[PDB]
Subunit: 257 residues, 3 copies
């Protein structure tokens, strides 16, 4: 919108947002349903993204309760409304899915560092939300599962690309085509978690990471993330040119100050 | 061909094929030569690929005996016929090598999951065959070696791309330009094996993986593999579009049933 | 130049070069400043690259003393000359940075295998130098840090691409946007080191790697490195074609001998 979602509107969609200076914390807030996700949840995540204050540069996504997210609410695969919105002509459906994917795409923005702090299960859409973030910090209780193929579906919430980046195509095939669940130890071995900590220490681990990030100047953090996101698809000559162009802008700003 | 290779024809090329419903098992069957590969073997692997029944969605490649494959039969580097076929103008040679590479390229098909179950040495062409599969399960006896450069040759049986995907360019350079042999522990550390099991347990490990794969519906498995194979080279916007296009086709099929 | 830099010229830039047959050893030689790098150092590294004898196929980069490199000399961020050269219109600056990046780009050449042998800290530009090499062998004393963002700068000495290749985009974001220091154990876990050895064993480990590399014929090593560098950005069909084209050239040369 132009208007940021209100706390009341977010509560109706199963979310909480708090902002403290440069840090925004989004909490999945349907513990009674193990933070199962709905269309409304996804479109409100997109609206949070589109309306975040310019000063926010770090976004932490957490769940309430012991489970990060059990994935799509199973009510979404029936006729009636969910979270007040009507569930899932082909063009229409395509537009709807695109609208949901917007809730995950913004987590890649160069001007934020997005962090998923995952306890318990992150299943399907929930795994994809965690994959969509820059960084994952897992509790030792975390369990990850790309469940969609077991349901007859593909992963369509933008998780395929980060999965392949993290684990390689071959392991991605094995995880997705078995739809198996992996524990935090395995997740760490496969580079799916940047850090694994004891459950009781997850909030402190997130806070420590946030403090490290805040200590690096915002503009250099943003420029560097933008460079890193381009590096895999550019040839080396091109990437060197992109790097130097970015450095010229940093030097120009530092000269102004 | 139109016609699948017969068991007799395959035996003359050093191979066995058995099909049981949705699963095909190809066994390299020259244990007396440590499953060294020949031109005939490669072109018959291509013909198996081209003629597989539509119902087959899983392909397991194994060796007979303690060695997966010692790589190219050293008789291939002389004048006389091998396996009845004449060994390796420049255009002709190029066509011949292309014909051999077809024996490995089909293992990437989206409609199959290919699994290499590797005991003992997988050298050169043998390593490349294992690399060409989606998944590798290694015995604790497995030893892998990209030998070609030590012989004055390059890897030309399609192994370079999967190697780089699995281990990264830098480690790939180190493994290939030293032509060193690595053991199963190292192979697991480097992501070259998805699983390492005791030698006596390799058949059971393959069966367990096959059972997991069969439990996921075929059409969703195929669509998801197709998505995963595209993810590395697409930008994120494009991959999101590809994902949603694939989901629309899944939803349309699920609606028909 | 046409002329290789002299030992005297290199000493003035903080470097030593020795060549013994097929192996060149470049040593960063300002231990009193912890091998901090300067513009002159970078441009002389480029000149070493451009003038290396054709017979050199292996390049080892080491530091004198306990620290590989503390990164850019802090004198480079002031008015006066450094190493006799004047420090860092926008076009001019762009040309200057491009000239420095040439000191790192040549380490990717297909006709060499470049090896960084790292003790102690490799910070910023120093980390990027190590990243620019094909292979890193670390002492157990090694500490790596992408410091630039903490200084308000981006990494612009060509390190972004190898970093992302080695560790994946997500971990690269975490390392760069925290500007944190990692130890050799972590570096090994993240694939930043191909090998980690005890400090006293680093020279022997480098020598052992050099011996393995020399045992593989030069032309096959060069062709294979060239193939590996292309594999990530090519589709599989294309890479198979590139591989076979390269094999035809190997077979033609082997037939001549
Ligand atoms: S996108 C892909 C698809 N997602 C899924 O298949 C996941 C479905 N859920 C699960 O597998 C399990 O709930 C787990 C593993 C997440 C948690 O298991 P448990 O810890 O045993 O908790 P339990 O299953 O009792 O769940 C607690 C409550 O959350 C509800 N719930 C859990 N997941 C979902 C969901 N996806 N949709 C709707 N409700 C859910 C349960 O129905 C249960 O409700 P109840 O208290 O009224 O019985
Ligand atoms: S593509 C790249 C090139 N390939 C190669 O360099 C591998 C050649 N082979 C080897 O290094 C070894 O045979 C190993 C490591 C595979 C196995 O070693 P060992 O277990 O000691 O078994 P051994 O070498 O005795 O081999 C058993 C038999 O297979 C034969 N054999 C093994 N590899 C090959 C091959 N590539 N071509 C032809 N015959 C072979 C051996 O000549 C031997 O025959 P024999 O029983 O008539 O003597
Ligand atoms: S590109 C990015 C930027 N680079 C940096 O921030 C690194 C700066 N240096 C450091 O952090 C530290 O020197 C370390 C970690 C490398 C080594 O720490 P220590 O082992 O405690 O050694 P110490 O800091 O005393 O350094 C030894 C000498 O090298 C000098 N030195 C170290 N790094 C640099 C540098 N980048 N520029 C100039 N001089 C340097 C120190 O000033 C010191 O000089 P002195 O003997 O005249 O006091």
């Amino acid at each position: 919108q132009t208007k940021a979602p209100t706390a009341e509107e977010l509560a109706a969609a199963g979310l909480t947002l708090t902002i403290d200076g440069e840090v925004a914390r989004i909490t999945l807030s349907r513990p009674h349903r193990r933070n199962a996700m709905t269309g409304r949840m996804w479109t409100e995540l997109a609206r949070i993204g589109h309306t975040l204050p310019q000063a926010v540069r770090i976004v932490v996504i957490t769940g309430e309760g012991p489970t990060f997210s059990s994935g799509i609410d199973l009510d979404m695969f029936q006729a009636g409304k969910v979270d007040g919105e009507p569930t899932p002509s082909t063009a229409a459906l395509d537009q709807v899915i695109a609208s949901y994917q917007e809730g995950f795409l913004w987590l890649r923005r160069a001007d934020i560092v997005s962090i998923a702090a995952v306890r318990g299960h992150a299943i399907g859409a929930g795994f994809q939300l965690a994959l969509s973030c820059d960084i994952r910090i897992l509790s030792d209780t975390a369990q990850l599962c790309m469940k969609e193929p077991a349901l007859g579906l593909v992963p369509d919430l933008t998780g395929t690309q980060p999965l392949v980046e993290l684990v390689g195509v071959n392991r991605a095939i094995e995880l997705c085509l078995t739809a198996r669940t992996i524990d935090a130890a395995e997740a760490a071995q496969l580079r799916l978690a940047e850090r694994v900590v004891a459950d009781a220490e997850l909030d402190a681990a997130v806070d420590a990471l946030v403090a490290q990030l805040l200590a690096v100047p915002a503009a250099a953090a943003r420029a560097t993330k933008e460079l890193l996101l381009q590096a895999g698809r550019n040839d080396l000559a091109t990437q060197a040119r992109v790097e130097r162009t970015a450095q010229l802008a940093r030097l120009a700003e530092l000269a102004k100050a």
